[model samples]
Every structure is written in C-alpha cells, then in structure tokens.
Target: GTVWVTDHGNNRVVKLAAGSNTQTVLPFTGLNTPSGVAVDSAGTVWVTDHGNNRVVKLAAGSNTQTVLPFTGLNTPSGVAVDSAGTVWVTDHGNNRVVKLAAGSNTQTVLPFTGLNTPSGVAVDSAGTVWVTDHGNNRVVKLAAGSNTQTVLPFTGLNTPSGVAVDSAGTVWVTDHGNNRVVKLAAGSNTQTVLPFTGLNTPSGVAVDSAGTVWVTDHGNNRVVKLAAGSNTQTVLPFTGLNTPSGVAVDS
Candidate 1:
C-alpha cells in the first residue's frame, strides 16, 4: 500500500511507499489548497483542489492529472473512493456531497440534506457514507442508498475536519479544533480519543491496510503514525511539509 498526503501550505500532493520514510511530490504543479485525496485499487489518485474549485484524477503511472469537469464546485474539501471505485466528495462551499460513478462523466448529488461546510467524507464497504459536518459541529452518516442521514453521537464534536472508515468499517475522525483524533469502532456506540500529546492541530486521519494509523499534524508541520496495537506515535520523516490537510492509503 501507498500513503498519500496533500501538503496544503506547500501546494503539492506527496506519496510515500510502505516501509519508506522519504516522500516524492507528484509531478503535477499549480495545485492550490489540495486538501482531500483518495486512491483506488488501480492506484488512480483523486484529490479535491479546494482553492481551485475543482477535483483532479491522476491515473496510475501517469504523472499528469485530469482536472475533473465539475461545474461550479466551490471549495471542495473531502474526497473518498469506495470499494466499487465510485468517487465521493464533500463540496464545502456548496454545502453538499457529490459522487461520480467509476468511469462516468455526470456527477450525481447525494440526497442528504442540510449539510453546512461538509469537510470530511468516507465510504465504507457497505456503501454507507460518512461525512464530517464541519459547520454543524457534528458528524453524520448516510446508509447505502438511503435518504435519511443520521448525525453521529459525538458529544462536543467541535470543528470536526477529517473522517475515514477502516476496512473493518470502524470510523476514524480528526477533531480539528480539539487537537485530537477520535475513533468509533464498528458496531460500537462509544467514542475513544487517542492519548496523543502536543498535537496543535490534527487535520487529517487515515487507517492504513496494516492497521497502523496515519495522521497529519498540520499545526506542527509534520505527520505521525501509530503502529498496530500500539498507542505511541512515530513522527514520519516527511521534510518541509507545511499544513498537510488530508491523508489517504491505498492497497
């Protein structure tokens, strides 16, 4: 598996192969506020160019990117690719969630209602949609093909920014303003906060295939990882990363 991060302050998306500390910035340039990223099984990379008001697709082995033909996308923030290869995005400025089928040109807006500044999006194996409702200070989930959106029971969810669903279907989130990473195990109601120290602003969270957790410590200008069954974090050796906002892993 490979790890991907959007270095927002540096305006680049960098990738690191497993067992490697060094990172290589993807060749495409002119990225502004590239905040969200999702890589599919085929190694195709999808990113939300937040400042550019559009999304982009970087095919495997293709250094260049195909700027998605999304119309009127204002500040698109979060992105995810489901098991079925569908692309999902949270349009923060537009206050809506949109999806594009694999290899399709038309974008279909999901039926969830009243999303204010949705920032983080994740689609689980069951096709359930999870979104961090940033402006509402809560997280919401939309069941597969359902119209009813359920607000998750995260008490005092202040400025929730990033969300990821693990292969086990457990949910992970970055409580941005609170400077913490939160987790909700599959079929469990209780939320658990990791014992992290000195995380000034944790903006992005991802659970890799090996069960290690990767998080972007945005304010500290660094990234940290936690081994499987371990609580201690090892800061990744990604030099010159400034304000990295989104992190994703692909098998």
Candidate 2:
C-alpha cells in the first residue's frame, strides 16, 4: 500500500512507498498545478491539472501520460475513477462535473444542477458520484445510472471542499470554512460533525483500510490523522509544504 499526493506548489506528484516511507516524484512532465488524484483498479493514476485546465492519466509502471481532451474543462479541481473505469471530474471554473468513459478520450458533461464551484469528487461502491460545491456551501450526489442530482443538506457546511467515501459507505468532507470535518451517514444523510480539534483550513480528505481519516491541514502545513470511531486526532507536521491539497490512500 502506498499514498499518492499532489504537491501543488511543486507542480508534481509524489508517491510514498508503503513500507519504507520513501518518496518518489512521478517522472511524467507537462503537469501544471496538479490538484486532485485518484487511482483506478488497474493502478493508473488520474490527475486534475488545474493550472493547465486538463486531466492527465499516468499508466501504472510507466512514465507515459495521456492528456484527456475536453472543451468544457476549465480549472478542473477534482478527479475520481469509478468501478467501470470511468473518470469523473469537477470543473470548478465551469461550475459542473464531467465524466469520461472508460476507454474514450471525449468528455460527457453530466447534467448537474445546483452546483457552485464544485471542488472535490469521489465515487462510491454503488457508482454514485459525490461532489463538494465549495462556493455553495453544500455537497451534492449524483445517483448511478442517472444524470439527475440530489443535494444533501447539512448544517454548518462552510466551503465544503474535499470529499471521500469510506469503506463503510459513509461520506466525509472537509469543511474548510468551519475548520472541521463532517460526516454524512450512508443512507440517512444525517450529518455528524467529528469532534476533533486543531484543524486549520482542512483541505483534502481520505480514508484508509483501517477506517482512519487522513486530512490535509493546508493552513497549518501539516497532515492530520483521525481515528474512525473515536474521532481522536494526531497531527503530523511537515516542513516547506506549498499548500497541500488532495490525498488518496492506496491499499
């Protein structure tokens, strides 16, 4: 198991090897301000290049890259791969979400409504796509096999940014404006604010196999680990980080 993170300031991505904690920068070029990252079943890394307004895919075990083409993309912020290998991205500048078929290069913009600056994106086991509308202060869900969207209304959502679905199907979001993390129940959509403190501008979020929540505290320049059931936080500091944004766990 390894961890892939977008070093936004450095204009590159780094892979943290599982056992040794060794960091290796991906050799692919032409990346401009890469933000969100997701790995598919085949171990391919999908990245959203915000600065370049495009998405790139790096094949596993190779330095080759495929720049996906889409005219609707503008400041794409988040990227996720579904079970069918379809890529979903949040076009922040366009205020919409777009999907690319498993083997195609063209993008099909989903019929998303009520979106305001969609940022982070994630696909659940049920194939539903969840997005964080940063400008609207809410999260929206697009059901599988349909283009219609349903907004999940939760109180105290301020600049909701990065989102992730855990192994148990619970949705976790970083309320960047509120300086905390929020969780939504699988089917009920009941919102619960995790009780951990010491967060300063939490950005990207992910869940590990053991059900721990990992968050990037962008304002403080550190990453935080929260125990699943306990909601206890452990802060891990890093030096010279240039606005860490998205985080993804590989297991």
On residues 117-138, what C-alpha lDDT tens digit does candidate 2 reach at each position?
Answer: 8889998767888899899898
Index of the highest-TM-score prediction = 1
The ten-residue window of minimal lDDT in model 1 covers 63-72
TM-scores vs. true structure, each candidate: 0.96, 0.92
lDDT of candidate 1 over 1-251, digit per residue (tens)? 57899999989989888778789888766789898888877888889999998898898778688887666788999899976888889989999999888788879898888889999899887899999999998999999979999988777778889998887878888999899988888887899987667887788888877777888899999888887788788888888998999899876
Give the winner by lDDT.
1
- Candidate 2 has a TM-score of 0.92
lDDT (C-alpha) at residue 31 in model 2: 79
Give the C-alpha miss distance for residue 177 in model 1, angstroms.
Answer: 1.1
Where is model 1 more than 4 Å wrong at Cα? none
